[PDB]
Write a protein that binds this ligand. Sequence first.
Ligand SMILES: *Cc1cc(O)n2ncc(C(=O)OC)c2n1
Ligand SMILES: [Mn+2]
Ligand SMILES: [Zn+2]
Ligand SMILES: [Zn+2]
Lengths: 60, 73, 915, 131
Amino acid sequence: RKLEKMADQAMTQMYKQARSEDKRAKVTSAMQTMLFTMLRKLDNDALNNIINNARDGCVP
Amino acid sequence: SKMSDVKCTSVVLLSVLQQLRVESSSKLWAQCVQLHNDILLAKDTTEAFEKMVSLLSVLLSMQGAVDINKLCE
Amino acid sequence: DAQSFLNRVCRLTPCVVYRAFDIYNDKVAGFAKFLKTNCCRFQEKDEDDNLIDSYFVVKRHTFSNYQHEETIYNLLKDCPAVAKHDFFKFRIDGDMVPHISRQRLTKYTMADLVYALRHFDEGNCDTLKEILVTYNCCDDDYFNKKDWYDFVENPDILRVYANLGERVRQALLKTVQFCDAMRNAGIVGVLTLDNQDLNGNWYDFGDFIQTTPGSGVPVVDSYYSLLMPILTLTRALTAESHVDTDLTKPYIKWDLLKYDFTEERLKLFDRYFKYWDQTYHPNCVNCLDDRCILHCANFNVLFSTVFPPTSFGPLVRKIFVDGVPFVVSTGYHFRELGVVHNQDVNLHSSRLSFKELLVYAADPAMHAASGNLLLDKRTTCFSVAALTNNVAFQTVKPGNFNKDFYDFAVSKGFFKEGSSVELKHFFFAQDGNAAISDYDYYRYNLPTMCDIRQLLFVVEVVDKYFDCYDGGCINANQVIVNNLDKSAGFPFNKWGKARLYYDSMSYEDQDALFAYTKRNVIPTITQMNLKYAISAKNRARTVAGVSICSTMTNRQFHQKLLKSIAATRGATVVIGTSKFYGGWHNMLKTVYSDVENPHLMGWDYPKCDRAMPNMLRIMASLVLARKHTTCCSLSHRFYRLANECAQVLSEMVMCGGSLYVKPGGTSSGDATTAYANSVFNICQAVTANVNALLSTDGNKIADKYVRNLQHRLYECLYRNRDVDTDFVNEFYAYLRKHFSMMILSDDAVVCFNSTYASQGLVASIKNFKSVLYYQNNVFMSEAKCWTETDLTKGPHEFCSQHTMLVKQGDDYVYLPYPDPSRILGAGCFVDDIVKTDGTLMIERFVSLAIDAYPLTKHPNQEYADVFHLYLQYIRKLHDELTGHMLDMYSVMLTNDNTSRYWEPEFYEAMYTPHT
Amino acid sequence: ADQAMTQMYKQARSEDKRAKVTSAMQTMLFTMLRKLDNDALNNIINNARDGCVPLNIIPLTTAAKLMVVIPDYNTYKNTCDGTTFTYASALWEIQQVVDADSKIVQLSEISMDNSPNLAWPLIVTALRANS
RNA sequence: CUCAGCUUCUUAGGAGA
RNA sequence: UCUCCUAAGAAGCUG
Ligand SMILES: *Cc1cc(O)n2ncc(C(=O)OC)c2n1
Ligand SMILES: [Mn+2]
Ligand SMILES: [Zn+2]
Ligand SMILES: [Zn+2]
């Protein structure tokens, strides 16, 4: 039973480090995706108009 | 309404701007920080949305920095 | 009798008010406002029919006092500091009655000004406005501005007050002349502020008695002591900075190499305080005890404003080691402590050991001497040098958004329209010129002279609050360091953490360093760092990283007492007491302490760390050091005080790669910051009580016990020199009985007898406002404070916690609950990206649920829902973690003991007294 | 036996780190003293009555370089207008100006019209004139 | 990237019943 | 199996 606990702790540490590295690597793309998802949800007229203008090429 | 949504989106937007190395411009970073802090303290949704548009204009001005077309499909 | 009388008094216009008096007799004592006796006041009009500040005051007197005053005036007649008197007799009812006409007095006296500036109320400042307008300090239209009196919102008021300084200085000079006349004529009497007008003339000789001509004896204790705060508030001694003491002449150009101003200080003392009979030591290294240190440091604070700012700080000398020259600090010139010289200065050293090398690395002398000259125009603080070719602009990043928790909360009905629970705590971002802006808030620290006779009694009463603790020095092996992975300060932070230096230095080395600091002053550099925390205010907060040498020696000096304070339950200082397992209830029941008509009040200091005057910080340090009566000598304790001042009071600050001079204030980041704050808070409370009791009319106190308490309190302050232990004990018992405090750093709760407060026998919020105004240079707003008349509601706020009385089993207990917005903001926003992955951070949500549990007892369901939201999110996170573990590995987590983390019981057990 | 070996290893590590930090501090202290101006420092030290001088005057009277941080154009015109200025009873000649971004700024660019286009504060580095 | 206090969780070790 | 005490690591809150 003790060996099971040791293996469980080792696997928890491995999972923790894997998740930490993966989270810390994707930071920029994840942040941009989140930003534009939230902007889509907002559905304000001015934000949508500005974003569509930038998409078409009319940037400030 | 949408007050908390606007505030959270402004937080995420300033995080994205910082990730794009906007602190390398003292003027631009100061303006963005001012707008972000103003949005967080806002009590009127219209004023917060105006400042949100102003803050997103900065992000969209640097067209080459972030790929608008890819991000929204 | 309205036509001939006026002529005999004579260009005078024919003619209930309360004035401040300083009374002491066998019936009453105090400094309070009384009704003015009947007198005829004829206002003198200028030739242009313009009324001026000249009055003729004619009063009827008995024959005995008439003759007595006439004799004394004839003795004192030829002094120019004495107002002109006219003695005559006037026919009334067929017989002559004596009248005395004090000629050309001003409308107000010095007592009026002192009372107005010390018992300040923003709603009842008519006398202060009249004084300010009459003497051209400002115009009526200056008071239409909001917060014209606030030192922070309206820092221009300092100039308006400074416009009175010359008047005050002239009054002091005339006082000295008057004392000389009294000594030469052989007259004995007590000088009181109410007998001197605002031109500096003295006009009341009733209590004076004659004596051998050369052996007169003026008494000036209460006069000078009550006047002292106004001297610094109005900047009276500014004229001493000019040539020939003329305000229209250029400033004196002192030699830059000059640092010893002992003779200048003695000249100033002999010029303005000639008949102050207690001995004055310009250099406090010659003082006899800590009471003498406070006494002489007060005068040093007053006098140091006259000398160039470049003369204060480390005194450096060139020494040789291995034949190469070093510039090292061999002394220090303190604004309050004068000149101090190190006793163990060694020239031509053979080689540097680890201890000497550490000391020389900590010294700011080499860093400043090797750096460039700096002229920083962003701040008004004295700038020493730039240690790098570039300026650093450190910013603050925004927080990270935990979108999963936000979505979960919104799906549960949170953040709707009109709900009482809204997001108010965020991570505010800052731009490049933020840290220096925060440092600039030290401009609120001003030289504040204290009422020394009042402070020397308040210090004894405050020391009464620290009699149950034990203290003294300990060896390097007995020291407890909580975290050794903290910064070691500058320049030590570039080679390792505190662990490196605690490991490199053996116990013998640390003991040697401590013994070295008991004979020498080591000035160190403090580093200002920006805090990255969640807050409801846009302000950025900076923390002070002290050097490792200062931290090490201060720990070895104070840790015994600090641990003793933190381990004691039931005392007024509640540092170290947990709020769990019934600790909150215990603390509240302790502070209630069977007060008779209990009301609760509370306050928190504005600009606490940036505005604390240096005198009160020195007083707190001396109170803490009073525990070394056996382990330390007088000089050991003095040098420990000097090191403390040089390291955490007026040391050099590293901010953005540059060295600045810190004017004063507590350095939040040193060993004893919280306990020193507690001492300062208790001192302010005791001062408020003293001013409340002595400013009350004694004839209207219906309790004989409290009237004799007032009389004896005045005696002990302004008439008795030696400490009266019995009365200190009695006053401490009185305060404990009627004014029960619970103190944690700059946070306080008070349970007080409301009847006494209404009668003026104990302090109230207005007394605290007055004391803060005249002793801390801050205006305290009534929105900062709070008052609760119902004890079942508990204190409104303490340490950011609200209180509720809830049934817990069979009895009602007080529980603390936080702002729901604070907990929700902690959940939604994090300072690290990896904290946004919930499955990795379940324990932090468990802790947040522990903090939020008492909200379930709230009568508002929106508040109660936060704890259930956190429990549901914990359940969801555990489910997701198990799913991910199964997907990533063909295993089962098998942990069935986590089910307790989404059930109320685990958290309910955290507030039950069993443990 | 294992515990004793671990303790010996820890003591060896501590001694090695102690030697490292000792060398680092010695190097810093000996590097810092090769930067100061020997002539001016010796002059002021000799002028001193008893050797002790306040530290705050060492940079004022002996530093060969001055850095001025200007927050706005008004302060610029007040303090360091032109290519030379007077401060601390000495004459300083401007050697370089940079903005908050650490970018060189020509003295012709510092004008009322162009002030809004500059990244304040400006940092001006000048050298003590007259040798 | 400071001082101090309190609290939760995990691990290694010692003692007692 | 339970309790206490030493150390290490993670985290939360407060002034
Ligand atoms: C009413 C009254 C009586 C006496 O004797 N007085 N002496 C001085 C003053 C006064 O207020 O002058 C400043 C005064 N008033
Ligand atoms: Mn009188
Ligand atoms: Zn003394
Ligand atoms: Zn001691």
